[PDB]
């Protein structure tokens, strides 16, 4: 029923060409190794309609053209548009007409164990229908096939449904045996590779597998063995929690609504409601209000909005006069008693109270303002009972004609009708000017042992909220740590503190060996508990996909906190340091009898891809407007250029110190008579046309606008010649050519001088000359093989060349950083935008690029200093290692130093140091001193050792016995100080 | 005393700038290879 979709759907994105480069794109793509349903054709007929959704990769195992065309639509009438494709007796017809099973037509070329394939792509991407065709003579089989683009048609229509149509055979019907499959495209990134002709060869989706992500990051289909940063583990907050005081108290809304007797409309009572929590959900659920009108506030945002203050206006009016309580509406109540602003953002609530506010004899306690002198300004309140002067005669405080009391009493009687019944009205003024007035906000129960998002008294953050047993002072609300981050908070209604620890997010890395070795992967998570993310918990995080081993091996791929994973599945373990060996001794000596002269590659970057940046050309190009704008921004460009010139002159002077250490140029004769020490791979052969070493050739073929690259003052040939001179000096004439003339001195006695340097007599060399020569030449051969076959032999130079390369690459891609504008060319900005804003946006873009260039040269100076120190070290170690012997340990390589040979390299140097490495110690016997005639005899330089039979004087590092004569022993005191000394 | 090590600090640019805010992080992704080169420099610090 289910089968693997394998590796189909890969296509060229558009009509652009790419030559031997890898591009990563983000569009709707078909997943890989995807489990796709398998179809059958044979009385059961499966005729499903595949949903288009965002698109499909539709391939067919089609022979003799059973499949003819598709129908796209949703409603199947004239309101929508339907696309129809047919292949009649001559050609393939593309039409768009509204068939009831004309707007657009098109014509293409005539078309006139599984064997045939026909791949089609249905993409509707922003109204574009890119067309691809790929037919190849051949369960979708294992194979590779890309889909070349043919037509990009901007249809501009929405597609949701599609289905393939069949035709019976006329010659009675015959149905063939075949199966087709449909996948789906999703937004994911691929790893495209293009061959030397420019065609797709290997493709990898980034997020398909952890190995796939490693390939996506490293931009290669081959990956070395190691650990690589991939992403960061995002711990998602499980739940949203809100905790507020909002205690029962809430707001005194009841006292206003449920009051016994209200104030009259003219003297309406204003109550300031503040410092409490609103519960308006009750008012809507109350269902006891005759009038419920909210003008400026809607119920959706009403219950969850904050305001500075809210005032409770309440009064009693009649049923007919309720309606005048409305913004814009006026009258006898809304002009003289209480006027709402026409911008009334609030609510109007009223309800019948003929039960309370109606007396049988007549409730005359609720009054109004009938007749007021003028209208009222906003926030004006007429409580004046001043007798009205409705004429010319002044009212001397007495009633009568043209002298009326401005307040008349309501005729509240229970017998009165609906409109005359007393309707109690409460108006809550909503205004905002500090937010002490809020709603319920819903205090959500908290969680434990989970980093989530919380709202504690208006505070938000992410971190685990667990139990804490600390007692802090009651008045303090929340605490902070040394780094000022919040660590605890008090929840209301419990008054208890919760210790907040930073949530468990961390980086993502993939422990993957080389693709040449295997393809199993495991994922490491930085400081992530295994209970929230077979699965193993490290000291550094959670390890998924590997199996921990109690046994501990040697570390090869650091994981974290000492955890290390090696290949068997990939097993991980705590790293084992090594073998516990040292046997501390008192009366035991051991004298070495053998050794190895190992030769180890030592690598130091020397030069960089020195460059000088025309600031104006960089930022602008040839744009006169941009140049005129930029030149007014100061001497930042001059600083940039001059710093780069300093870099360049520094590079040249480091090169001169490294190579032109001697102004006089000695030369190697064609007659390279060294007495059996063949240096062909290091010394350029006079027969070799370009005078470069084979090791240099291996190095060079191993290693791989608007800016310049300045040539080195010493070109590759001239550097090689300098190295040749250095070799000639240090070989034929030895070390003294640094201090002056290349004082010639034969090589065997030069090596004798070197052994005298490390503590060995020249006789030892002369007896060992041939054997050390054979060891040295074999080691040179091993060096040849290691450099030829070792991709990690050039780690340092290859990575420094990289650093320069992707430094310049990020430099050039920075010009492609658009920063939100329409076109980086100024013409489009000016043509489609106003010149004043175009100028400002130009300034923003150019200053962003200027900052970018300054940052680039900042790190360029950083490596300038770094590699400058490294090259100083390089010159120092040619002085101590080529131009002489170094007493320094771990400076000419590992161990006592014997000899060195510089070699040219791109922007750097490579050495073959001769480092003395002992081996196979032999365990022996010694006494503190030898007492002869009561006198202690000590060798001037050697140590007395005995093999079990006789006493001998030999070397500090080796067993070379000799006769203890009068020239190695001296007169000094007696034997009476040593304890246990024997008489010999 | 010679100090030997700092606390290697691989700072995620996206987390530093926007935290877990999806909208802010997505807007940050538009801005370019800034965060990429910064993280590569920081990882260089760590590996050094
Ligand atoms: C160190 O040990 C090696 C063992 O390989 C010695 O080299 C051997 O020497 C014998 C004596 O002539 C030869 O017959 C073998 O062919 C050599 N073997 C190899 C692999 O070269 C070497 O002489 C020893 N050196 C010292 C100083 O003890
Ligand atoms: C030097 O001689 C001493 C003799 O005591 C050696 O010590 C013992 O060597 C044996 C050889 O395998 C071990 O089994 C013992 O465990 C060693 N003794 C102790 C206390 O550990 C010593 O190993 C010899 N060193 C060399 C390099 O041969
Ligand atoms: C009147 O008091 C009750 C208490 O029983 C309260 O629930 C109600 O909300 C009050 N009336 C109004 C209109 O709020
Ligand atoms: C030294 O090496 C070269 C090149 O590998 C080889 O031709 C030569 O025979 C070797 N031996 C001598 C003594 O030159
Ligand atoms: C010790 O060395 C001497 C010098 O060659 C030798 O004569 C003697 O036999 C050696 N002893 C043993 C036990 O091998």
């Amino acid at each position: 029923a289910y089968t693997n979709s394998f590796t189909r759907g890969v296509y060229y994105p558009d009509k652009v060409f790419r030559s031997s480069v890898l591009h990563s794109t983000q569009d709707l793509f078909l997943p890989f190794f995807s489990n796709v349903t398998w179809f059958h054709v044979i009385k059961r007929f499966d005729n499903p309609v595949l949903p288009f959704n965002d698109g499909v990769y539709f391939a067919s195992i089609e022979k003799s053209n059973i499949i003819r065309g598709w129908i796209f639509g949703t409603t199947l009438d004239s309101k929508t548009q339907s696309l129809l494709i047919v292949n009649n007796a001559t050609n393939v017809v593309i039409k768009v007409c509204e068939f009831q099973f004309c707007t657009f037509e098109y014509v293409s070329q005539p078309f006139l164990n599984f064997k045939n394939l026909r791949e089609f792509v249905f993409k509707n991407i922003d109204g574009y229908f890119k067309i691809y065709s790929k037919h190849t003579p051949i369960d979708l089989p294992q194979g590779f096939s890309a889909l070349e683009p043919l037509v990009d048609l901007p249809i501009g229509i929405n597609i949701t449904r599609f289905q393939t149509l069949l035709a019976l055979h006329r010659s009675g019907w015959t149905a063939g045996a075949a199966a087709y499959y449909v996948g789906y495209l999703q937004p994911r990134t691929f790893l495209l590779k293009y061959n030397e002709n420019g065609t797709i060869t290997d493709a990898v989706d980034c997020a398909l597998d952890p190995l796939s992500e490693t390939k996506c990051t490293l931009k290669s289909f081959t990956v070395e063995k190691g650990i690589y940063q991939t992403s960061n583990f995002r711990v998602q907050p499980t739940e949203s929690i809100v905790r507020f005081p909002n205690i029962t108290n809430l707001c005194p809304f009841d006292e206003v609504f449920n009051a016994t007797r209200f104030a009259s409309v003219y003297a309406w009572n204003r109550k300031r409601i503040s410092n409490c929590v609103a519960d308006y959900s009750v008012l809507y659920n109350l269902a006891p209000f005759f009038t419920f009108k909210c003008y400026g506030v809607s119920p959706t945002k009403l219950n969850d909005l904050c305001f500075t203050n809210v005032y409770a206006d309440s009064f009693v009016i009649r049923g007919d006069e309720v309606r005048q309580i409305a913004p814009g509406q006026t009258g006898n109540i809304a002009d003289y008693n209480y006027k709402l602003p026409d911008d009334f953002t609030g609510c109007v609530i009223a309800w019948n109270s003929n039960k309370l506010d109606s007396k049988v004899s007549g409730n005359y306690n609720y009054l109004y303002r009938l007749f007021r002198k003028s209208n009222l300004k906003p926030f004006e309140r007429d409580i004046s009972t001043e007798i009205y002067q409705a004429g010319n005669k002044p009212c001397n405080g007495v009633a009568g004609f043209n002298c009326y009391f401005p307040l008349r009493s309501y005729s509240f009687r229970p017998t009165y009708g609906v409109g005359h019944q007393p309707y109690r009205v409460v108006v809550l003024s909503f205004e905002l000017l500090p937010a002490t007035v809020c709603g319920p906000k819903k205090s959500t129960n908290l969680v434990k042992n989970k980093c989530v998002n919380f709202n504690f008294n208006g505070l938000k953050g992410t971190g685990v909220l667990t139990e804490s047993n600390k007692k802090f002072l009651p008045f303090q609300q929340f605490g902070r740590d040394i780094a000022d981050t919040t660590d605890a908070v008090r929840d209301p209604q419990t008054l208890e503190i919760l210790d907040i620890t930073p949530c468990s997010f961390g980086g993502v890395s993939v422990i993957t060996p080389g693709t040449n070795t295997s393809n199993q992967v495991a994922v490491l998570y930085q400081g992530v508990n295994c209970t929230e993310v077979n699965v193993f918990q490290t000291r550094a995080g959670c390890l998924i996909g590997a199996e921990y081993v109690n046994n501990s091996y040697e570390c090869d791929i650091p994981i974290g906190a000492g955890i290390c994973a090696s290949y068997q599945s990939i097993i991980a373990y705590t790293m084992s340091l090594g073998a516990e060996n040292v046997a501390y001794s008192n009366n035991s000596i051991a004298i070495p009898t053998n050794f190895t002269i190992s030769v180890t590659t030592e690598i130091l970057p020397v030069s960089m891809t020195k460059t000088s940046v025309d600031c104006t050309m960089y930022i602008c190009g040839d744009s006169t407007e941009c140049s005129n704008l930029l030149l007014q921004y100061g001497s930042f460009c001059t600083q940039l250029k001059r710093a780069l010139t300093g870099i360049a002159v520094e590079q040249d002077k480091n090169t001169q110190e490294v190579f032109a250490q001697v102004k006089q140029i000695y030369k190697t004769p064609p007659i390279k008579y060294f007495g059996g020490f063949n240096f062909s791979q290091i010394l350029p052969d006079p027969s070799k046309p370009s005078k470069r070493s084979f090791i240099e050739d291996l190095l060079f073929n191993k290693v791989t606008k608007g800016l310049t690259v300045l040539p080195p003052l010493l070109t590759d040939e001239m550097i090689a010649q300098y190295t040749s001179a250095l070799l000639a000096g240090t070989i034929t004439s030895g070390w003294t050519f640094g201090a002056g003339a290349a004082l010639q001195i034969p090589f065997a006695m030069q090596m004798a001088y070197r052994f005298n340097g490390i503590g060995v007599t020249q006789n030892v060399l002369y007896e060992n000359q041939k054997l050390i020569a054979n060891q040295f030449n074999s080691a040179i051969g091993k060096i040849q093989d290691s450099l030829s076959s070792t991709a990690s032999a050039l780690g340092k130079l290859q990575d420094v060349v990289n650093h320069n390369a992707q430094a310049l690459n990020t430099l050039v891609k920075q010009l492609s950083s658009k920063f939100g504008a329409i076109s980086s060319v100024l013409n489009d900005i000016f043509s489609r935008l106003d010149p004043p804003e175009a100028e400002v946006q130009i300034d923003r873009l150019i200053t962003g690029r200027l900052q970018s260039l300054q940052t680039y040269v900042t790190q360029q100076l950083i490596r300038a200093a770094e590699i400058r120190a490294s090259a100083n070290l390089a010159a120092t170690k040619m002085s101590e290692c080529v131009l002489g012997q170094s007493k320094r340990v771990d400076f000419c390589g590992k161990g006592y130093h014997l000899m060195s040979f510089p070699q040219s390299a791109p922007h750097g140097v490579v050495f073959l140091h001769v480092t003395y490495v002992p081996a196979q110690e032999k365990n022996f016997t010694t006494a503190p001193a030898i007492c002869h005639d009561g006198k202690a005899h000590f060798p001037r330089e050697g140590v007395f050792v005995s093999n079990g039979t006789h006493w001998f004087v030999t070397q500090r590092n080796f067993y070379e016995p000799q006769i203890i004569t009068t020239d190695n022993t001296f007169v000094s005191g007696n034997c009476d100080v040593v304890i246990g000394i024997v008489n010999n």
Side-chain angles (χ1 to χ4, degrees), chain A residues 1-271 273-292 294-305 307-440 442-984:
Chain A
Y2 293 71
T3 178
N4 280 11
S5 169
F6 284 131
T7 67
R8 276 303 81 89
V10 57
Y11 70 99
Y12 294 83
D14 49 352
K15 311 284 178 59
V16 298
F17 171 68
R18 313 159 201 158
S19 178
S20 66
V21 291
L22 291 73
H23 186 273
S24 298
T25 178
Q26 173 57 269
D27 272 332
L28 294 174
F29 279 100
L30 183 63
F32 292 165
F33 284 173
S34 299
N35 189 359
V36 65
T37 310
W38 181 65
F39 291 157
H40 68 90
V41 179
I42 199 69
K43 202 130 180 194
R44 281 292 299 156
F45 53 100
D46 288 339
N47 295 117
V49 176
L50 277 296
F52 181 76
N53 288 314
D54 58 0
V56 289
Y57 157 78
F58 193 81
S60 177
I61 311 168
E62 182 56 49
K63 49 199 306 291
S64 72
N65 294 113
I66 297 89
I67 300 176
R68 309 312 268 273
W70 293 271
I71 289 306
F72 302 90
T74 316
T75 67
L76 300 192
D77 57 356
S78 59
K79 277 168 192 65
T80 57
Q81 198 175 8
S82 294
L83 161 69
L84 184 142
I85 319 289
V86 286
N87 175 23
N88 50 3
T90 62
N91 208 339
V92 163
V93 184
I94 295 93
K95 287 193 314 182
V96 179
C97 306
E98 297 170 313
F99 289 91
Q100 182 64 42
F101 283 125
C102 277
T103 44
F104 182 76
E105 295 85 4
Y106 181 78
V107 178
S108 68
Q109 75 172 359
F111 268 47
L112 314 178
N113 196 9
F114 301 139
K115 284 307 204 61
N116 305 110
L117 62 89
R118 294 291 192 271
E119 290 180 289
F120 320 123
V121 165
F122 299 144
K123 284 204 302 185
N124 190 51
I125 318 300
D126 312 306
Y128 297 166
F129 182 76
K130 279 84 73 177
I131 307 191
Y132 311 82
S133 182
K134 182 60 190 293
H135 65 279
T136 300
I138 47 158
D139 211 0
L140 293 147
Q142 175 178 0
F144 197 59
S145 62
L147 283 72
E148 302 74 71
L150 197 59
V151 171
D152 181 13
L153 183 63
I155 48 173
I157 66 169
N158 189 5
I159 306 164
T160 295
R161 184 178 66 245
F162 78 109
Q163 198 258 336
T164 181
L165 308 162
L166 73 165
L168 290 187
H169 292 331
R170 298 272 186 178
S171 68
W173 58 286
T174 318
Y180 74 98
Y181 315 86
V182 165
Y184 269 120
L185 303 183
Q186 291 80 10
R188 265 154 77 106
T189 56
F190 283 13
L191 207 71
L192 277 296
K193 185 158 74 64
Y194 295 78
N195 80 324
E196 283 63 20
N197 208 343
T199 198
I200 299 175
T201 54
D202 289 319
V204 168
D205 178 16
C206 299
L208 159 72
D209 295 325
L211 187 65
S212 75
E213 278 290 336
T214 67
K215 301 175 191 331
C216 187
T217 287
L218 277 296
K219 317 290 279 154
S220 174
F221 69 110
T222 176
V223 172
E224 193 62 31
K225 191 158 46 57
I227 192 66
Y228 325 115
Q229 283 260 318
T230 56
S231 198
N232 289 44
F233 181 109
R234 314 301 300 101
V235 192
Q236 297 323 94
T238 75
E239 198 50 276
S240 173
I241 47 177
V242 171
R243 179 67 262 176
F244 280 162
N246 72 279
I247 293 169
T248 151
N249 21 270
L250 276 238
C251 290
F253 292 165
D254 290 345
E255 291 76 0
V256 182
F257 290 90
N258 299 341
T260 48
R261 174 173 156 172
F262 292 168
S264 300
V265 57
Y266 64 92
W268 50 269
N269 194 338
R270 163 163 306 234
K271 177 67 183 173
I273 303 295
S274 63
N275 210 350
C276 64
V277 161
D279 192 7
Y280 283 80
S281 54
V282 181
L283 310 185
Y284 298 96
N285 200 5
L286 295 174
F289 298 132
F290 177 80
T291 297
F292 206 109
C294 295
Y295 310 81
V297 286
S298 70
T300 300
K301 66 96 181 178
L302 192 147
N303 305 343
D304 56 356
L305 196 48
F307 312 104
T308 307
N309 299 104
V310 174
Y311 292 165
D313 303 335
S314 51
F315 46 86
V316 163
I317 63 189
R318 284 199 256 114
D320 55 335
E321 285 158 347
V322 169
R323 292 188 296 272
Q324 296 195 23
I325 311 293
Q329 176 72 258
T330 58
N332 192 31
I333 304 291
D335 293 343
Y336 313 140
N337 293 267
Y338 182 76
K339 179 174 174 64
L340 283 72
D342 292 349
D343 193 4
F344 181 76
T345 309
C347 287
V348 160
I349 300 167
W351 64 104
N352 195 312
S353 165
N354 200 42
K355 292 189 292 185
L356 282 72
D357 291 331
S358 307
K359 187 177 179 181
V360 177
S361 66
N363 181 28
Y364 296 159
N365 281 293
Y366 288 107
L367 284 81
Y368 48 70
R369 183 161 299 273
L370 179 61
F371 62 96
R372 199 257 176 265
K373 296 292 177 317
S374 63
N375 54 2
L376 291 180
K377 70 182 183 291
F379 282 144
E380 188 185 354
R381 171 169 169 174
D382 189 9
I383 200 171
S384 71
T385 45
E386 159 191 327
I387 308 185
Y388 203 87
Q389 195 184 334
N392 290 337
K393 293 179 179 179
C395 295
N396 298 335
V398 297
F401 186 65
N402 286 332
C403 291
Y404 314 116
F405 187 67
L407 282 69
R408 294 183 181 277
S409 306
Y410 277 120
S411 65
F412 291 166
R413 292 182 183 174
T415 311
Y416 270 101
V418 173
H420 272 219
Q421 285 177 17
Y423 274 54
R424 297 199 160 194
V425 182
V426 166
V427 171
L428 309 185
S429 171
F430 274 121
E431 53 84 19
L432 193 144
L433 294 174
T436 58
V437 177
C438 300
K442 177 43 225 315
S443 265
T444 300
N445 187 354
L446 61 83
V447 298
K448 299 286 192 149
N449 193 19
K450 269 169 301 301
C451 64
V452 298
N453 51 2
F454 42 77
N455 184 359
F456 279 85
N457 301 328
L459 298 173
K460 284 191 159 191
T462 61
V464 297
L465 306 90
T466 55
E467 199 269 358
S468 74
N469 54 6
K470 321 310 164 286
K471 184 272 291 193
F472 294 101
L473 287 156
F475 64 110
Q476 322 182 260
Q477 203 144 330
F478 45 76
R480 288 176 178 177
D481 203 58
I482 305 293
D484 291 331
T485 70
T486 318
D487 54 31
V489 66
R490 290 179 150 92
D491 72 320
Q493 295 88 23
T494 313
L495 314 181
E496 206 270 335
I497 65 155
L498 294 181
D499 196 1
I500 311 174
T501 296
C503 169
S504 179
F505 68 90
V508 187
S509 289
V510 169
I511 297 89
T512 178
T515 79
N516 181 228
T517 298
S518 166
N519 291 298
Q520 289 185 257
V521 289
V523 289
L524 161 73
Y525 292 96
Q526 301 276 25
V528 185
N529 202 323
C530 277
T531 184
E532 209 272 349
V533 65
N534 290 318
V535 171
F536 185 76
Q537 180 65 73
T538 61
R539 187 72 179 266
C542 194
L543 183 46
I544 293 170
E547 154 179 51
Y548 171 102
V549 183
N550 292 357
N551 196 352
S552 195
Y553 303 150
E554 284 315 309
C555 189
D556 62 358
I557 302 174
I559 297 172
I563 301 299
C564 297
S566 188
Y567 193 70
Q568 60 93 20
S569 61
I570 62 170
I571 68 153
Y573 48 90
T574 67
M575 75 83 57
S576 77
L577 277 296
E580 204 297 313
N581 283 134
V582 183
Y584 182 76
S585 77
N586 276 29
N587 71 328
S588 179
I589 201 170
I591 309 296
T593 74
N594 215 329
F595 63 89
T596 183
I597 298 305
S598 167
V599 176
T600 295
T601 177
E602 181 145 19
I603 301 99
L604 291 73
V606 176
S607 179
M608 283 74 74
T609 303
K610 64 183 181 293
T611 186
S612 66
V613 175
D614 189 358
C615 173
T616 307
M617 187 66 204
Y618 193 110
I619 297 169
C620 300
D622 63 358
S623 165
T624 184
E625 305 104 5
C626 185
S627 54
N628 297 345
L629 262 68
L630 166 61
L631 268 293
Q632 311 295 324
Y633 284 97
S635 73
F636 293 99
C637 299
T638 79
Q639 293 179 356
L640 294 174
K641 296 183 290 294
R642 292 182 291 112
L644 299 189
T645 61
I647 297 169
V649 65
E650 280 178 348
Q651 199 67 104
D652 291 331
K653 69 170 66 65
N654 296 115
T655 316
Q656 188 274 331
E657 172 36 70
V658 170
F659 304 108
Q661 188 274 330
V662 298
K663 67 186 81 67
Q664 63 267 16
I665 318 299
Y666 309 109
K667 280 302 177 185
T668 61
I671 43 171
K672 318 186 199 321
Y673 182 76
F674 291 163
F677 304 71
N678 52 343
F679 304 161
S680 61
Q681 293 314 70
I682 68 171
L683 178 58
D685 210 335
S687 77
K688 188 269 183 181
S690 70
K691 325 327 294 172
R692 289 191 288 262
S693 75
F694 177 80
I695 297 169
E696 182 271 342
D697 189 358
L698 272 50
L699 295 174
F700 182 76
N701 64 7
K702 179 53 152 32
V703 302
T704 56
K705 305 178 294 295
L707 272 74
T708 175
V709 64
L710 277 296
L713 172 64
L714 319 180
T715 180
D716 62 358
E717 313 274 348
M718 294 177 71
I719 297 169
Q721 293 179 356
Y722 270 116
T723 61
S724 73
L726 294 174
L727 294 174
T730 192
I731 283 160
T732 53
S733 69
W735 60 88
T736 73
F737 75 94
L743 310 172
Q744 70 275 17
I745 175 172
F747 209 81
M749 283 73 74
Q750 167 206 355
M751 294 298 102
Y753 279 5
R754 307 290 315 234
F755 291 171
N756 291 126
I758 59 148
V760 194
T761 53
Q762 65 183 357
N763 187 13
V764 172
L765 185 141
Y766 298 142
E767 66 183 1
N768 203 0
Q769 159 159 45
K770 280 75 68 178
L771 191 61
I772 68 186
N774 296 115
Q775 174 44 100
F776 174 41
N777 75 26
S778 297
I780 290 299
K782 312 316 178 282
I783 294 297
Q784 183 178 2
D785 214 18
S786 177
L787 277 296
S788 64
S789 61
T790 308
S792 58
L794 294 175
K796 292 181 181 179
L797 294 174
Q798 189 274 331
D799 69 53
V800 67
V801 169
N802 290 318
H803 294 89
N804 290 138
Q806 69 274 16
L808 294 174
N809 206 355
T810 52
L811 188 151
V812 298
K813 312 203 211 158
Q814 187 64 66
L815 294 174
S816 67
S817 165
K818 191 67 185 71
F819 295 112
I822 49 173
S823 295
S824 64
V825 179
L826 295 175
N827 274 315
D828 189 358
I829 305 161
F830 280 119
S831 65
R832 280 165 60 177
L833 277 296
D834 291 331
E837 272 66 49
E839 285 298 82
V840 176
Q841 297 312 298
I842 290 167
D843 304 336
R844 181 258 184 275
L845 301 181
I846 68 154
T847 199
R849 292 180 179 90
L850 183 63
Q851 183 178 2
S852 65
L853 175 57
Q854 183 62 255
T855 315
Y856 154 70
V857 308
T858 316
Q859 307 93 27
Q860 199 70 26
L861 277 296
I862 297 169
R863 279 82 65 192
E866 183 178 1
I867 297 89
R868 184 191 201 310
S870 73
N872 290 138
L873 187 86
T876 300
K877 65 179 73 175
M878 293 182 286
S879 312
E880 299 188 48
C881 312
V882 189
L883 286 65
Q885 181 188 36
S886 182
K887 302 290 186 181
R888 288 188 50 172
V889 176
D890 291 331
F891 182 76
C892 307
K894 277 73 69 177
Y896 304 91
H897 191 219
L898 287 176
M899 187 66 204
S900 292
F901 297 77
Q903 184 64 254
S904 66
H907 292 257
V909 288
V910 176
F911 293 99
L912 320 188
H913 299 288
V914 172
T915 62
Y916 182 76
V917 174
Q920 292 118 326
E921 73 281 9
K922 165 154 185 44
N923 190 358
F924 279 123
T925 300
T926 299
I930 283 299
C931 200
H932 173 68
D933 299 331
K935 174 76 166 323
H937 298 245
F938 306 93
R940 273 189 208 186
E941 75 284 16
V943 60
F944 289 148
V945 303
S946 67
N947 55 345
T949 49
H950 283 146
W951 270 115
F952 303 102
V953 55
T954 178
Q955 308 166 353
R956 194 281 301 191
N957 293 285
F958 293 99
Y959 174 46
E960 187 177 85
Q962 268 197 357
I963 309 296
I964 312 157
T965 65
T966 66
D967 298 8
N968 51 39
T969 46
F970 55 96
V971 170
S972 175
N974 54 77
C975 303
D976 276 330
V977 176
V978 192
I979 308 150
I981 182 172
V982 304
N983 296 345
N984 199 84

